[PDB]
Structures are given as C-alpha cells and as structure tokens.
Symmetry: D2
Subunit: 383 residues, 4 copies
Amino acid sequence: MNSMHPETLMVHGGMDGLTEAGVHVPAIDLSTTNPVNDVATGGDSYEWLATGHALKDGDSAVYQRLWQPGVARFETALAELEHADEAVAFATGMAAMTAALLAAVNAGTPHIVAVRPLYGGSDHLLETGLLGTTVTWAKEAEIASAIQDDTGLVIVETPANPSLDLVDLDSVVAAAGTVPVLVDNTFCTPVLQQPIRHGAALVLHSATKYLGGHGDAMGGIIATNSDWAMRLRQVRAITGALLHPMGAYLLHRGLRTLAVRMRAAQTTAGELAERLAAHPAITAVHYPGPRGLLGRQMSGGAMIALELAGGFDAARSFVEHCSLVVHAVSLGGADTLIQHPASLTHRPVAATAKPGDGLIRLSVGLEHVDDLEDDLIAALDAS
Amino acid sequence: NSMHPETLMVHGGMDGLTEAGVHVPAIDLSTTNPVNDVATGGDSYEWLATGHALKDGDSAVYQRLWQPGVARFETALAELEHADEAVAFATGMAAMTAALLAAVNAGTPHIVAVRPLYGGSDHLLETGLLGTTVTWAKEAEIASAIQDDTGLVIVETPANPSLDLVDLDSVVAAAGTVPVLVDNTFCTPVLQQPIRHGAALVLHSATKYLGGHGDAMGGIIATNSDWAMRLRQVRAITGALLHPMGAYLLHRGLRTLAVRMRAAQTTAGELAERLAAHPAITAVHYPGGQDPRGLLGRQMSGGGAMIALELAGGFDAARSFVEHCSLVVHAVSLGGADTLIQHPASLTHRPVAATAKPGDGLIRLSVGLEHVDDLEDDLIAALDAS
Amino acid sequence: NSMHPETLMVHGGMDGLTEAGVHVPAIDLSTTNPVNDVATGGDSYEWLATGHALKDGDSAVYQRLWQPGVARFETALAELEHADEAVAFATGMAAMTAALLAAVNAGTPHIVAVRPLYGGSDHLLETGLLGTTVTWAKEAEIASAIQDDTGLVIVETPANPSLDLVDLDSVVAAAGTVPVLVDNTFCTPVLQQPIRHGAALVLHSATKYLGGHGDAMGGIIATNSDWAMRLRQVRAITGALLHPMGAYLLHRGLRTLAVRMRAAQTTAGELAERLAAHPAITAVHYPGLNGQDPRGLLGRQMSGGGAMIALELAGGFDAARSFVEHCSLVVHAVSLGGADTLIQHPASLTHRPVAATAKPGDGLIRLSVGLEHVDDLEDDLIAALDAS
Amino acid sequence: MNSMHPETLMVHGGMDGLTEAGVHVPAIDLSTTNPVNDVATGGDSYEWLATGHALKDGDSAVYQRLWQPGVARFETALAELEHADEAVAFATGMAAMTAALLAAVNAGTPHIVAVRPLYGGSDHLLETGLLGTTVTWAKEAEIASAIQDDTGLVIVETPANPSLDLVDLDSVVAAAGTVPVLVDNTFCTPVLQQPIRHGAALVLHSATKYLGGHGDAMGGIIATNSDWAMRLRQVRAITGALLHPMGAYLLHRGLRTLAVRMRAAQTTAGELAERLAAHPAITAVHYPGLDPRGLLGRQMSGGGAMIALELAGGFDAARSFVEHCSLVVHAVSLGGADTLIQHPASLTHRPVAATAKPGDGLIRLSVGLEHVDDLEDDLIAALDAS
Ligand SMILES: CCCC[C@H](N)C(=O)O
Ligand SMILES: CCCC[C@H](N)C(=O)O
Ligand SMILES: CCCC[C@H](N)C(=O)O
Ligand SMILES: CCCC[C@H](N)C(=O)O
C-alpha cells in the first residue's frame, strides 16, 4: 500500500483482509445493530465509537450509526489515494460539508473564510448560516486579512464551478496559517490533485461525481487528519447522515475503475475542448491549460465550460438540441452531461434576447470524441 | 376510500404501480434526473429547493431535491399516521436533527423537552450542537417552562427504557401555540397516533419496527404541510438522504407491520406475565395495575412489544443475565425479527464491584417473532445462571 | 432443535451470525473465491463438484460450486421441512428441471406424475425437453403406472387451481421403492410437511410465500443427502444459480412466514365463508370449508386451510372475466403468496381470445389472500361481482 | 445506436427511453409478477412470451420467467455490440450453454461437433451428455468430416482455455456450412472479436468475466439471430435459469466501462508478457500479441488480457508460484478488477510427488486494472521464491 502506484492502489485499496477471508469483493453487511461478546467489551466499544474514534480490530461495531464495516472500507480506500490520516463518509457531499461546519461551530470557531467561486450548495449553506456559522467571502489575495480570531475553516474549491478557474493551494495554506484549509477536490479527484500534499487539512469529495462514476450511488467523504476525522465522526454519530451499505459498496467498487475512467475522460475532454474552440458560435472555451498551476497542483480535467456568443438563448437552444449528450444537473457519470448554470437562478425568462449568461457546463463521459463532437456541433448549428 | 389500517399498510404508497404494470415499486438509484425543458427544469429545481413536494409530470432534478423511492415510503407512513405529509432521512437522528435545525432558523431555538427521552435525542439537546437551548421539564411543568423563544416540545411515550407513559392530551393542551413532536418509534402507527391527540410532528426511527428485520436504517417525521416544507428545505441543503435501497426495504416492511406488531405484542403480553412469576425479578415493566390514567384504549390500543425487567441482584445479575442468553441476542436496538436484550445502565457505568443502583437492575427486552415457550425457556435459563 | 416452528423460522439459517458480530447474513456477491492452498483448494473443488456441501473452513472456490448466502437459505428451509439438506435454484422451474435431469442421468427417465399439476410442471413433462417419459395416472392408478424405468413420482397438494387434496400417505405407499416429489408451494412448511408422510423430495417455489412480498424469484427442494448430492451436481454444470440478493430476500422472508401464513389463512377462512353467501357463486373451493375434506386430511396432513380460494361462478368465463377486470384493490396478476391479494382467471391462459361470448363452462377464479383486512377484501370482491 | 463507435455504444447501449423517462440509470424492477390491463390482452402477452417472442411495447411482462425489463435492457446492449439480431440472458454462462444444447436436442439435432480445447464446464457437459446430446470431438481440419445428418451445433472457442490457442473462425463457418456455429467469446469480448461478422450464428458470453468486470455479478448471454433467440427464450421460460434484476443491472452497468477496461488490461498484458519472457524460470509465454495464421487484425483487434505461462520446474514450480503471490490473487476466474492467478493442472491432478507432466507447468493469468510495474514486481518475487 506504500510502494504501490495510484492505479494499483485504486483496485486493492480498502480490500484489506478480503483475500484472507476467502472472498473476492467486500460483503454488504446491512446490519443496523451489532451483537456484543461481553457487556464490558461492548460498553468500551460504544464509548470509543461515540467519542469519534475508529473501530478497533476484534470489537463489535455496536450500531450502524457508530460504525459500518462497508463504509469503513470505502473510507480507508480514499484516505490512501489522498494520503490523509483518516476519512469520514456521509450520505451526500452536502452532509460531509454540514458535519465539517457543525464541528467547527462546536469547537468555538463558527467563522469561515470561504473563497469564491464555490459550489451552489456550499455557497448557499454558508450564506444562510443554518448551522450557526459566520461567513466572510474573500478573494484569493484577501485571505490573510479576512481571518478573524473566531475562524475555524477556510473553504476553497479548485477548479471553480462552473468557470473552472484555478486557485493556487500553496498560497491559500500560507495565507491561512494556523487555520485548517478545506479543499473541495470533487472535480479533480485523487487522480489529478491531492490537497494534502499542498498543506490542506481537510479534502472534501462529493462521491456522487467520479468516485461512483456511473450516476447511481450518492455519497460524500472528507479525507483529513485524525483530529478532524474524530470531530467529523462525533457529528456523524449524533446527526446520523450515514452512508447506506449499498451506497458505500458501489462508491468503493467505483474507486477500482477510477484511474482508467479519469484517464479516458480527460483525454476525450482535452481533444473536445480543442475541437470546440474552432467554432464561430463559441467565443471562448474554458479548460485548464498563468501561475503554472498545472504540474505543480494538477497532473488536465474532464470538465469543459463553453461561453457562447448568443448568450442565454443560444445556451438554452444548445442544451435542448443535444440528443446523445444528456441534459441533467450532475457530473462524473458514465455518459456526457450538459447543463445551463445560469438557468437555475434565471428561470422564467420567457425567451428574451439576453446579452450575457452564455456559459454551459459539460462533464465529459466515456464516449468517443467523434460522436461527442458531432452531437454538440449539431446542437450548436440548431439556432 | 375508508381503508382499515391492515389494508392501508399493504397498499399504502403503492399508488399507480398496478397501472404501470409492476407489482413492487422500482428501485431508482439515479443520482441525477434529466429534464424536458430548461424552463420546466428550472421551475422544478426552485419548487423542490423551497421544500415543496414534486408535482406530477416534473423531473425530480437531483436525488438531494427528490427521490421517487423515498417519496412512496413518505406517503405510506403519512397515511398510516393521518398526517398531511412525511419527510424521510438517513436515520431517526437525522430526522430529529432536521426538526431542530428548522426550529432554530425559524427564530425558535428553545426546546421544552420532557424527560425521559431516547439517549441520542437527550444528548443532542444537552450538547446544543445545532444552536438549541433546552429546558428539561416534567409533564406537570410544561406550560411554565415555555418561553417566548420556544419552537418545539419534544415528548416520548412509552419512555426509554422505563416504558413510562405520557398523556399526550395533557402535553398538547399545556403547549398551546407551540408544536408538539412525539417520538412514536416504540408504539408505531398500529398502537398509537399522536396526530389524533394534537401533536404537530410524529418522529419515527424506521430502523425499529418499520423495517422490522434489522437491515434498513431510517428515520421519518409525519407532520403538517408547513412543517414538512421546513424539513424538506433542511434535507435539500444538509443532505441526510435515505438511500433508494433503504427506502424500498422500509416501505416493504410497512406491509408486514400489522401482522408483526400483533404477534410480537401478544408474545410480549404473555412473556411479561410469565417473567413476573420469577424469584430473580422484583417488578416487571409492561404497559399492558400498570395503567395509571386510563391511557390504554384512549391513546394506546395495545401493550407494545417492549418489556423492562427489574432484577434483584443489581448490576451483577443484569450483566450475567444478558451474557448467559443464547437464543436472545445481546445488542443495542429494537423492533427486529429476533428478540434483543440490552443493559441500559452499562452504557454509562462500567463497574468493577457489586453495585445495586436504581437503574442497574433494569434490562430492556424487544420481543421478536418467536414462540413464547422458547423465549421463556431461554430467559429462565439465563436467570438461573447466577 | 427443540424449537417451535415460529422460533425456527426466525433463527433458522442464522448460525454463527451472533458470534461473528452481525445481525443479518452478509450479502457476498463474490463470483470467485480465493484459496488458501493449491492442495486445499483443489480438494474443495472436487468436493463441491461431486455434489457435497461446503465443509467449514474451506474456500467456496466459485459461485457455481457454492454461495454462502444461498447456503444459509438452504439450511433454513431444510430445518422447517425436517429434511437432510436443501438445494436452491433461480426459480421453482429450475429446481424441477434439475430434479428431472438427475433422474434421467441415474437411468430413470420415466416419471409417474399424478394430475392435476402446476402449468409449468405439467408442460415440462408433456414436452419431454429433458429426455423424460411421463405417465399421467390418477391417485388410485399410481402402483400400476410404475415401470422398472421410473425415477420420480411427482404429486401436488392442494392441486392448482382446483385446490383438490391428495393423500400423501397413500401416494408414498403406492410408490414403494420410487422416491416421491411433493410440490409444497401452496401449503408451505407451516401447514404441511411431506417428509413426515414419506416423500423423498419437497419442491418449493420460493417466489410464492417464502419470499412473501413478490420481489424475490426462487426455487428450493428439501430432500435427503443422496438426492441433494444429485441435485447439487446438476446445479454445478447447468448453472441455474440463486443470486445472493434473491437468496437474502428469500431467507429474510422465512422469518415473517409463520405470522404471515397464520394471518392470511385466517382472512381466507372467513373470506370463503362470506363469499359462499353470494348469488353469483355456485360453489366455493377451500380446504377448510365443509365438503372439501373427504379423507380427513385436515389435521393429519394439513394443520390449516391455507391462503388460496377458488370460486365457481354461475356466469361461466364471462362472469369470471368481468369479475377480474372489476377489481380495484385486488390486483389481477398471475402469481400467489404476495403481500397483497391477487386474482387470476386460469381458463384465460389457454382460452384467451374469447370475444364477448356466453360460454357455459370455465367459471373458476383463483384468489391468493394477502395481508389485508377481511372487510376491505369482501367489499372489493362483492363490488366486482355486482358489476355484471 | 447505428453510426456510433463501440466506445459510445457501450455507454448508451440498452439505455433507450431512459432520458425520456426522466431517469439517469435503468430502474431495478424486482417484481416477480406483472399485473395486466385486460384479461384478453394479458392472455395474448402470455402466449407471445411463452412462444419465445420478445415483449411488444405497451404490453405487460406477465411474469419474470416470461420477461424481465432489467434483463431486457442488458440483452439489447450486448446484441448491439455484437451486431446480432437479439440476445438471451441466463443466470450463468453454463445456463446459456445448457439452453443452447437443450434447444438443439428438441429441434431433432442432438449431435454437437465440438472443437477441442474447450472451457472445463462446456467440455464436461458434452462428455456427460446430461441433456441428451451426442458429442464428436474433432480438430479444426476435421470439422466438415465430423458433421453428421443429426448435427445441430458446432461449438468453438477462441482463444482456447487455458492454452490461448487461436481458431480461424472463417474456416470453421465454411466447414460447418448449413450447421450453425456457437463461438465462446468470453475472453475476447465484443471489443476485440466479433463472431457474427465471420459467420457464427450464436455468440456465447460468460458475463461473469469482463462484462461484469468487478467479480460480483454472475451471468451468461448469447447474442444470436431471431430464430435461435426464440428457441433459447422458449427454454428459459420452462427451465427458468433467469438472471436476477440486480445481476442484470450490474452486468449492464459493467458494459459502460468495458471499452476503457479492456484497452487498459490489454495494454498491461502486452507489456507483462514481454517482460515475463525475459525470465530464467519461464520457458515459453502464451500471448496472442507476441501470430502465424494472421488472425490479429482480421479476427482479433488486440492480444487480449489473458497470459499463459510455461514454467521449467513443472508442477512443483507452478504450485509454488501461485502460493507465493501476494498482490495477485489465487482464484478460479477471469476479467475481474484485480489480477487473478490459477493452476489449471491442479483441478484434475492432486499429487504427492513433483510430477513433471505436459500441462503441469502451465499457469493462467487474468490481467486486471493495476500498474505493470507492480504486477511485474509481484510475479517476479513469486518466481524467485520457487
Ligand atoms: C444544489 C443544486 C444541485 C446542482 C447539481 N449538484 C450540479 O451538479 O449542478
Ligand atoms: C447508539 C445508541 C444506542 C441505543 C440504540 N440505538 C437502541 O435503540 O437501543
Ligand atoms: C406457467 C403459467 C404461469 C402461472 C403463474 N406462475 C401462476 O402461478 O399463476
Ligand atoms: C474451477 C473450474 C472452472 C473454471 C473457472 N470458472 C474459471 O473461469 O477459471
């Protein structure tokens, strides 16, 4: 597990002891409750798990809200890829972010210096302050100044959603100093980026996108140090946003095919963005590749943003004229997905010739570049 | 039409399935849902994000906004409980968390909680993790403990693990303008319905009884449209969703609920009576002179499937009792297919001496679907081992 | 063990789970199973290919040889049926197919099958797809129809869809040296146990009652070690395996079987009595009802009337077709033992394109009583009958 | 689904109408029985499905043994990749082969001209004659002579198991003439080999290997013309070796990642066999891309992900090599996510002595999705331990 390449680590990660048990894949244990050997041993295991610690070997899991073996394997698998001490799995990416914010509030640090742009849900949860949080939206150059004596977390996302703007993680961690940094590494995945290497304390992942890879398993996981993992596990035990054994099995199963899926989707996206650049209907294409963020932080990407000349009307027509490419709000699936991010806020437009709002997000799937190029070209021509 | 609860448990939430050509609800694992139009999809997104239910003929947009499998399970329980709508979460604690978070954001962070309460619910209010201020009051101190900042009144009947009953008619009258949340996990919609008494929210830990087999984790609140909208808004941003597989098993479990509860309660009623005639046990706690205010018949149409045993030996006798059981499995849960046993005093105390404290002798027992002779013979053998 | 059937249904097949620290059996989807040693793995392969059960502490080798989830469900039903072992297949027809294939390879392709039999079982013997020769004999013609080439005697009680009872004590006595296969799908191990009467094989379509919710497809035969070995050999090469998910749901369904059967039978016993007092129906077919127990089989063979009812309508096929299409709560589908009440017209499977005719015969309607209230089921069926 | 490249066809194949229904993945319908609209329409659908025909749109599936929608989507998906008229899915690869043999017997053609080498199970099923079949084991050049007026099928497998010897499919179909040809395309998959293009009538696939791709879903499917697909569907309706909805969903899901998995596994295998050739312990390496007949390019667009190893030590060295692997798992299967190793000679021979016999030095290896450096370092360590 230490001398293995990431491709080998994705397949055998979290599969510890399975070869020895006589099985090929991890068993799906749906057990809500777990019987105990001795009242004394079961009571100790209850206190140990309720305090946020990891289940010691040879001890009963006690209850699924305290510990689930299926979830546990998926947690260790991602922690190995991200090179973090431990990982904590939740029902969704928003449930992991919710627990990270709730832990900061209870530790006496309700203030968060978030750096925009951020994912819609993360941006709205901080803005609402539903979990008793204070937010200070600062730019990349205003991080060190926006830090208060009450700050508990610095939430950053690279590449940004949906603009795909890169943020230098080496500068963020240096500006935060004593404050831990949470990096939403959903778009990059552990294949292309590892925020732990740059200095981030927490690495948020929406397992729904890329980690699952098929658009069927909902999930969220944070790869962080033992201290933060304990806080996150304490919140999970009382708030109960658990990952179902079936979801945990499909997310762990999806990690095995992650290296090959990302390598293929990134190759297709690199050619697709270059081919789409040679089009009169698109003014500019947004694809990673000025500070030399590539190589130092990211080893490409499978997402492309397209700014159209027609604005909202051309973007709306482009989304509805796609047949092979599916119009839905998600990413990292098996098929190519398309979405209009401006349409989520500007909805009852009623077909007006808007000058702006012409950005279209696109999540490259596992299809041939010729078929995706021909489909999107057909949709662009329909105007 | 006017359906009996037994029929309503089987066909509830199964609307349109006969017409679609299927026997059981399909398990749609889809994380994202494609949209017909950009304009129609955007409206469905705003409608679902604002906490409203998915209108027919509209895309679910995303699983965090709406899941069809979860939706069927929600309507099935709401019919069983006679509440306007229901909201399903990953666990019973996730439903309680969303109920507390909604109260805080509505400007009512204060909660007047009536003890005894379930371990997790009690610890969540004491910690104040969600920005809540608790005021632990007795049944007769409810109206006095209500502050101008109170948003919810959390009560639980029968209590855990003492099985003490609380008069829901008195609680709702004392709360007045403040909504009442009743944790009806032990009772289920078969024996008790807090909506008919005046409660605004009805919390259920679907893990116990609703699942009925000890394999599906869940939590659901049957409440009025206004409170369901607030709960749905919290679920959309906090994301403590119920997995399609979990939602299918919890809904499937509702069909066999009437027959399971009527059999487990019958076994429990005889088991508690047979355990009373034992030298080791000083007193048995089973609702069915246990009834003080005539709550059975008026609030509960049965004694339930839970029994609490007061042992004479104290902690040591309770510890050996749950360790000598072979057929009865020692675990921390209830409402499963098999009979479960637990020592509630052991979760806080781990002594190395002969202790006889009030509560140390209490043993919780969740009656399963086994024969009363086999359960009596196993527990009688474990008691003799001392 | 000294356990009552109700306790045995819940804890049966759950051996070692309490000790492992789990509440329910794990769902192991593993197609292949790694081996500890080449020598130990090779022995486990030969042992499982020869039709023997997996010895404890040995690799399952491959799913076609052994599946732990299926294994738990097999032992759970073998305990309820009091048979030595049990073999689980994809469907009830896959279990019957393996039973017929084993008989052919043992040099006994002849089967003395007594009618009436289930549609699929009857059609498989008539077609002779597996190289079998059938001899359809009545209950009193069993001993005479037995040839020196007979390998199995297939009987079904109650019959489908007439619900006619067959005396299993007379069948086993007439078969003598020939093993008897009894389809105990309609009765389940709760009300009937063919092993107690002398049957060698007990066929069950786990889809009906054993699953109990209409979601898991299955088939299992509770039989002696010799027939279980023959059956296990056919399953290893023909590969009609039970998927781990299906095996888990069928095993899970056994826990709630005692309470489901007692409730459905109670509802059926009252439903048939209330339906008898109706002008549209001429005769009701229910084992518990008076007139449907000729040899005193209630108590000796069946400890209940079951949850199936057959209705003889005065209008014939058209009254039966109108009755099926006028049901709203009761679902019209071809199956039994589900959570909800199902209705079907058995004559419609063969006499399908009857367009607005007034045929005198074929007025039988099969009904599988579910877990609903007797008042709601009576009110729905009484409304469908009035629609004529 | 016509002008698409195989990589695109693997992702969107069998996903017809899902985008229109508002879902991202096919729903898992576990329904054993299917309700009907009319008695007359339901009876016609029963006869249509029992006679081996595919379900017409807008008709009830009637029963799972007659039709399953989940299985149906997987059959559509594979048949598109194989360019065959229809496909029939069964519980296992052996269940598909069993139905193919049973259909031939009932059509009055119990004779099968099989060409050695064949897969263990397929070879043992023909030798036993359990389904009333008479086999005639003939070489590639003795096909036309071994054909009797009673022959119904010609079963061939390329590459052979475990030798990986290639068979010219153009010569087999020409020698069979009027007799349909069944090709076991398990190892090759529709990515590298297409038997329909060469003239084969039936294409057998063990969906357990490669089609699933993770070692969790058991399956078997035959891509064949409408006539043979009807005869196979008739056998499936009465013999009932059905594919469970969960298995069918995972096998269909696995088709989406098939192109990327086989391109990566084949690349790793092509380098691994070349690196293993430069080793003192191995006398010869068996890998298609290391070709005298010119079958690569004409029949196979790649060397595959399977490698056979001929060791100098015989049985002793092969057994030691299998037990000295730590990263590579010793199990009897192929096409999984991880690299698997097996000793084929050990299944029949369980000896005390060293036993240097022909085939005892052969080791089968199924290349997974790992790095070539990690697999070379592990196998080189296991060889040094021997
Ligand atoms: C919070 C709205 C849901 C948006 C969706 N998760 C996306 O990928 O755009
Ligand atoms: C993890 C809390 C333990 C209490 C447990 N949930 C029960 O119902 O007994
Ligand atoms: C073989 C015809 C199908 C009959 C159906 N399985 C039933 O039990 O009603
Ligand atoms: C154990 C002999 C069967 C061979 C095995 N199914 C494989 O594919 O290697």
